[PDB]
Design an enzyme around this catalytic site. Structure first.
Site, PDB file in Angstrom:
ATOM      1  N   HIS A  28       7.499  -6.095 -54.204  1.00 26.36           N
ATOM      2  CA  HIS A  28       7.507  -7.453 -53.622  1.00 26.36           C
ATOM      3  C   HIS A  28       8.790  -7.744 -52.813  1.00 26.36           C
ATOM      4  O   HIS A  28       8.792  -8.608 -51.953  1.00 26.36           O
ATOM      5  CB  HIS A  28       7.319  -8.490 -54.728  1.00 26.36           C
ATOM      6  CG  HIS A  28       6.126  -8.228 -55.600  1.00 26.36           C
ATOM      7  ND1 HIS A  28       4.834  -8.496 -55.193  1.00 26.36           N
ATOM      8  CD2 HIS A  28       6.025  -7.680 -56.836  1.00 26.36           C
ATOM      9  CE1 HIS A  28       3.991  -8.138 -56.148  1.00 26.36           C
ATOM     10  NE2 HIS A  28       4.688  -7.645 -57.159  1.00 26.36           N
ATOM     11  N   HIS A  50      14.152 -11.395 -48.452  1.00 25.13           N
ATOM     12  CA  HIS A  50      12.842 -11.759 -47.954  1.00 25.13           C
ATOM     13  C   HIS A  50      12.907 -11.587 -46.430  1.00 25.13           C
ATOM     14  O   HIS A  50      13.902 -11.933 -45.800  1.00 25.13           O
ATOM     15  CB  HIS A  50      12.457 -13.189 -48.324  1.00 25.13           C
ATOM     16  CG  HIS A  50      12.458 -13.496 -49.801  1.00 25.13           C
ATOM     17  ND1 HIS A  50      11.304 -13.482 -50.565  1.00 25.13           N
ATOM     18  CD2 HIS A  50      13.453 -13.875 -50.635  1.00 25.13           C
ATOM     19  CE1 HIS A  50      11.598 -13.813 -51.815  1.00 25.13           C
ATOM     20  NE2 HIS A  50      12.890 -14.092 -51.883  1.00 25.13           N
ATOM     21  N   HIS A  97      18.843 -13.756 -51.249  1.00 27.87           N
ATOM     22  CA  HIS A  97      18.968 -14.568 -52.456  1.00 27.87           C
ATOM     23  C   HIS A  97      19.825 -13.859 -53.500  1.00 27.87           C
ATOM     24  O   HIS A  97      19.522 -12.732 -53.879  1.00 27.87           O
ATOM     25  CB  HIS A  97      17.584 -14.847 -53.042  1.00 27.87           C
ATOM     26  CG  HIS A  97      16.760 -15.756 -52.198  1.00 27.87           C
ATOM     27  ND1 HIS A  97      15.401 -15.914 -52.368  1.00 27.87           N
ATOM     28  CD2 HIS A  97      17.107 -16.563 -51.164  1.00 27.87           C
ATOM     29  CE1 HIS A  97      14.948 -16.766 -51.458  1.00 27.87           C
ATOM     30  NE2 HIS A  97      15.970 -17.188 -50.731  1.00 27.87           N
ATOM     31  N   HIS A 129      18.279 -10.027 -53.820  1.00 32.67           N
ATOM     32  CA  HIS A 129      17.125  -9.465 -53.173  1.00 32.67           C
ATOM     33  C   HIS A 129      16.914 -10.150 -51.833  1.00 32.67           C
ATOM     34  O   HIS A 129      17.590 -11.147 -51.532  1.00 32.67           O
ATOM     35  CB  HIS A 129      15.875  -9.617 -54.092  1.00 32.67           C
ATOM     36  CG  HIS A 129      15.526 -11.033 -54.365  1.00 32.67           C
ATOM     37  ND1 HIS A 129      16.111 -11.762 -55.383  1.00 32.67           N
ATOM     38  CD2 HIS A 129      14.744 -11.898 -53.680  1.00 32.67           C
ATOM     39  CE1 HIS A 129      15.674 -13.011 -55.318  1.00 32.67           C
ATOM     40  NE2 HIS A 129      14.842 -13.117 -54.301  1.00 32.67           N
ATOM     41  N   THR A 172      10.416 -18.575 -56.461  1.00 32.27           N
ATOM     42  CA  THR A 172       9.393 -18.473 -55.410  1.00 32.27           C
ATOM     43  C   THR A 172       8.442 -17.308 -55.660  1.00 32.27           C
ATOM     44  O   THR A 172       7.706 -16.878 -54.765  1.00 32.27           O
ATOM     45  CB  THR A 172      10.014 -18.398 -54.002  1.00 32.27           C
ATOM     46  OG1 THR A 172      10.737 -17.170 -53.865  1.00 32.27           O
ATOM     47  CG2 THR A 172      10.948 -19.600 -53.769  1.00 32.27           C
ATOM     48  N   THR A 173       8.464 -16.820 -56.889  1.00 27.37           N
ATOM     49  CA  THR A 173       7.541 -15.797 -57.359  1.00 27.37           C
ATOM     50  C   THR A 173       7.166 -16.232 -58.776  1.00 27.37           C
ATOM     51  O   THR A 173       7.952 -16.915 -59.434  1.00 27.37           O
ATOM     52  CB  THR A 173       8.196 -14.384 -57.350  1.00 27.37           C
ATOM     53  OG1 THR A 173       7.195 -13.375 -57.548  1.00 27.37           O
ATOM     54  CG2 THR A 173       9.299 -14.234 -58.402  1.00 27.37           C
TER      55      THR A 173
HETATM   56  N1  LIG Z   1      13.072 -15.900 -54.755  1.00 27.64           N
HETATM   57  S1  LIG Z   1      13.095 -15.522 -56.299  1.00 27.64           S
HETATM   58  O1  LIG Z   1      14.432 -15.554 -56.816  1.00 27.64           O
HETATM   59  O2  LIG Z   1      12.244 -16.422 -57.058  1.00 27.64           O
HETATM   60  C1  LIG Z   1      12.517 -13.987 -56.437  1.00 27.64           C
HETATM   61  C2  LIG Z   1      11.314 -13.656 -55.653  1.00 27.64           C
HETATM   62  F1  LIG Z   1      10.775 -14.582 -54.881  1.00 27.64           F
HETATM   63  C3  LIG Z   1      10.683 -12.330 -55.640  1.00 27.64           C
HETATM   64  F2  LIG Z   1       9.605 -12.143 -54.865  1.00 27.64           F
HETATM   65  C4  LIG Z   1      11.218 -11.271 -56.471  1.00 27.64           C
HETATM   66  S2  LIG Z   1      10.448  -9.760 -56.451  1.00 27.64           S
HETATM   67  C5  LIG Z   1       9.038 -10.068 -57.523  1.00 27.64           C
HETATM   68  C6  LIG Z   1       9.368 -10.255 -59.016  1.00 27.64           C
HETATM   69  C7  LIG Z   1       9.713  -8.920 -59.612  1.00 27.64           C
HETATM   70  C8  LIG Z   1       8.701  -7.955 -59.684  1.00 27.64           C
HETATM   71  C9  LIG Z   1       8.989  -6.704 -60.207  1.00 27.64           C
HETATM   72  C10 LIG Z   1      10.276  -6.392 -60.654  1.00 27.64           C
HETATM   73  C11 LIG Z   1      10.529  -5.002 -61.182  1.00 27.64           C
HETATM   74  O3  LIG Z   1       9.563  -4.234 -61.322  1.00 27.64           O
HETATM   75  O4  LIG Z   1      11.691  -4.607 -61.400  1.00 27.64           O
HETATM   76  C12 LIG Z   1      11.298  -7.357 -60.581  1.00 27.64           C
HETATM   77  C13 LIG Z   1      11.010  -8.626 -60.062  1.00 27.64           C
HETATM   78  C14 LIG Z   1      12.405 -11.551 -57.291  1.00 27.64           C
HETATM   79  F3  LIG Z   1      12.901 -10.562 -58.025  1.00 27.64           F
HETATM   80  C15 LIG Z   1      13.070 -12.893 -57.279  1.00 27.64           C
HETATM   81  N2  LIG Z   1      14.067 -13.193 -58.130  1.00 27.64           N
HETATM   82  C16 LIG Z   1      14.079 -12.781 -59.531  1.00 27.64           C
HETATM   83  C17 LIG Z   1      12.918 -13.542 -60.201  1.00 27.64           C
HETATM   84  C18 LIG Z   1      12.489 -13.044 -61.580  1.00 27.64           C
HETATM   85  C19 LIG Z   1      12.924 -13.929 -62.750  1.00 27.64           C
HETATM   86  C20 LIG Z   1      14.281 -14.644 -62.609  1.00 27.64           C
HETATM   87  C21 LIG Z   1      15.499 -13.727 -62.636  1.00 27.64           C
HETATM   88  C22 LIG Z   1      15.651 -12.640 -61.563  1.00 27.64           C
HETATM   89  C23 LIG Z   1      15.415 -13.161 -60.144  1.00 27.64           C
HETATM   90 ZN   LIG Z   2      13.997 -14.766 -53.434  1.00 28.16          ZN
END
Ligand SMILES: NS(=O)(=O)c1c(F)c(F)c(SCCc2ccc(C(=O)O)cc2)c(F)c1NC1CCCCCCC1
Ligand SMILES: [Zn+2]
Ligand SMILES: NS(=O)(=O)c1c(F)c(F)c(SCCc2ccc(C(=O)O)cc2)c(F)c1NC1CCCCCCC1
Ligand SMILES: [Zn+2]
Lengths: 241, 241
Positions: A50, A78, A101, A76, A182-183
Site C-alpha cells: 500500500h 503517498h 507522513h 511512509h 487514512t488507512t
Molecule cells: N496515512 S497513515 O498514517 O494512516 C498510513 C497509511 F495511509 C497507509 F496506507 C499505510 S500502508 C497500509 C497499512 C499497512 C499495511 C501493511 C503493513 C505491513 O505489512 O508491514 C504496514 C502497514 C501506513 F502504514 C500508514 N501509517 C501507519 C498506519 C498503521 C497503524 C498506525 C501506526 C503506523 C502508521
Molecule cells: Zn500516510
C-alpha cells in the site's frame, strides 16, 4: 465495511483552505530531537503493498509544543502516477505530486493499539513533495533502493540518515487539525500537522517513486492516496496569520 | 515526598495573564448536555477531608470541540477562610473567594485510572466564585447541606439539581491549557478550561462554605488550594479576542 471507524465524522485527509484556517499563536515551532541518525544500525525499508515505509529506531523525539511529546515510529509516502498528482491533503483543491507522513506515538502510551482512537495518541507530520531542479540527496538514499523492493511485501535494510532532511527546513509555518488514519482502521484522534513549506525532489526522483513499486496481483503501486474527507465543522489551525 | 509527579514540569494551578493568552477562533462554545438533573435519584455529597465532593450520575455529556467528548464524574470546590480568598487559579495575581471544579472523563477511556497521565484523558471545567449582593439559589442547595457533613469523612444524599446553573453565563468565553491534578497524585495531561466570567454568591454563603467543614486532627477544612505553578513555556489559550 469491515472497519466502522472509516465511516467516522472526523476523517483525514482534508482539503486545506488557508483563508478558513484559524490563526493560533499558541502553535510554536515543532521540535525534533535524535532525528540525525548514525549509519548503523540499519533501518528497514519495506514495500507493504500500500506504500513504502521506513521503520524508525528508538530515540526520535518530537514535540508539538511544551508538554506535547511524541516518539517517532515510522515514515511512509503517498504518490500518484505519470502526469497525475497523489498527495493526500490538498490546498484549495490543488493536489501535490506526493506526500511524506512521519507517524509518532504519544510518550503517554507504550503501544500503538493503546493510542488508537485516544485524543492526541498519534501525531503525524505531513509535508508535500514537489518537483525541484536538484536531486534531493536525503530522498535519494531511499529512492535508489526501490528497485530492490519492487515486489509487494519485500524489504531491504538501508543505513541510518538524517530523517529531518526528509522534511522541510521551516518548522514554524504549518496547519494543524484533528483527524484520522487514512488507512484501516481509520482511527480518529490523530493530530495532523501539515507544513506550509514543501520538499523538492527531481523529476527523475518523482518518476522513480511512482513507477518502481508493485502492489496487490500484477498491479503498479500508484495513486495510493485516500479521497478528501469533509471537515464537517472542524476548524484547521494555522501557526501564522 | 510521597508523589514525585507533583514536581513535574506541567502542573496546575497557574496564574492567568489575559494579555499573554493566545486567541484561537478554533475554540468553540462549550457544549454541556444532560446537566439539568431531576430531583430523584439523589446524589452523594461527601466531606472527604480535602474538599466537599458531589458525585454526578451517568449522562452528563460535555464537548470541548468536534469529537472531543467527555462525561462528568464529580464536582468539588476550593475555598479560603474568613477574609482570605481561596481560588486555585488566579488572574493577574488576584485570588478569588472560591473556585468550583467539574471533573470529566474522556469518552476514549473506560476508567479514570487509564486516563490519568494521558493527554486529554481528564478535563476540568473551572469557574471563579466571587461575592455578590444576592443569595445564589443554585449554590444554596449544596451550602445548606454542609452542616450535616461537617465531620471529616461524613456524607449525605442531596436532591438532584441543575449542575449547569452553578456555572457562568457565557459558554463561549474561556481560557484553556493543559496541566495537572492540584492534589496528589498530580497527574499531568489534564485539560483545564477556566471560564472568563464568574459566578456570584452572597457573603453569608461564602462564609458558610469556608466555616462549616472540618478536616484532618482537629483542623478546619479551609484554604484548600494549591500554590500557583509556572507555565514552563505553556501558552494559555483564549476563546475570544
Ligand atoms: N496515512 S497513515 O498514517 O494512516 C498510513 C497509511 F495511509 C497507509 F496506507 C499505510 S500502508 C497500509 C497499512 C499497512 C499495511 C501493511 C503493513 C505491513 O505489512 O508491514 C504496514 C502497514 C501506513 F502504514 C500508514 N501509517 C501507519 C498506519 C498503521 C497503524 C498506525 C501506526 C503506523 C502508521
Ligand atoms: Zn500516510
Ligand atoms: N483539583 S483536582 O480536581 O485535582 C482535585 C482536588 F484538588 C482535590 F483536593 C480532590 S479531594 C482529594 C482527593 C480525594 C481524597 C479522598 C477521596 C475519598 O476518600 O473519597 C476522594 C478524593 C479531588 F477529588 C480532585 N479531583 C479528583 C482528583 C483525585 C482523583 C483522581 C481524578 C478525579 C478528580
Ligand atoms: Zn479541584
Amino acid at each position: 465495511r469491515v472497519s466502522p471507524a472509516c465511516a467516522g465524522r472526523f476523517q483525514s485527509p482534508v482539503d486545506i483552505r488557508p483563508q478558513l484556517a484559524a490563526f493560533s499563536p499558541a502553535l510554536r515551532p515543532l521540535e525534533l530531537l535524535g532525528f540525525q541518525l548514525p549509519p548503523l544500525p540499519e533501518l528497514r525499508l519495506r514495500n507493504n503493498g500500500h506504500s513504502v515505509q521506513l521503520t524508525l529506531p528508538p530515540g526520535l523525539e518530537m514535540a508539538l509544543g511544551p508538554g506535547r511529546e511524541y516518539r517517532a515510529l515510522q515514515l511512509h509516502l503517498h504518490w500518484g502516477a505519470a502526469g497525475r498528482p497523489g498527495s493526500e491533503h490538498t490546498v484549495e483543491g490543488h493536489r501535490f505530486p506526493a506526500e511524506i507522513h512521519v507517524v509518532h506515538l504519544s510518550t503517554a502510551f507504550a503501544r500503538v493499539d493503546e493510542a488508537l482512537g485516544r485524543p492526541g495518541g498519534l501525531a503525524v507530520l505531513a509535508a508535500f513533495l514537489e518537483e525541484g531542479p536538484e536531486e534531493n540527496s536525503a530522498y535519494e538514499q531511499l529512492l535508489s533502493r526501490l528497485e530492490e523492493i519492487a515486489e509487494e511485501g519485500s524489504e531491504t535494510q538501508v543505513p541510518g540518515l538524517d530523517i529531518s532532511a526528509l522534511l522541510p527546513s521551516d518548522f514554524s509555518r504549518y496547519f494543524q487539525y484533528e483527524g484520522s488514519l487514512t488507512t484501516p482502521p481509520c482511527a480518529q484522534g490523530v493530530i495532523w500537522t501539515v507544513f506550509n513549506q514543501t520538499v523538492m525532489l527531481s523529476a527523475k526522483q518523482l518518476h522513480t517513486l511512482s513507477d518502481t513499486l508493485w502492489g496487490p496481483g500484477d498491479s503498479r503501486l500508484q495513486l495510493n492516496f485516500r479521497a478528501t474527507q469533509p471537515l464537517n465543522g472542524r476548524v484547521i489551525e494555522a501557526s501564522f496569520p
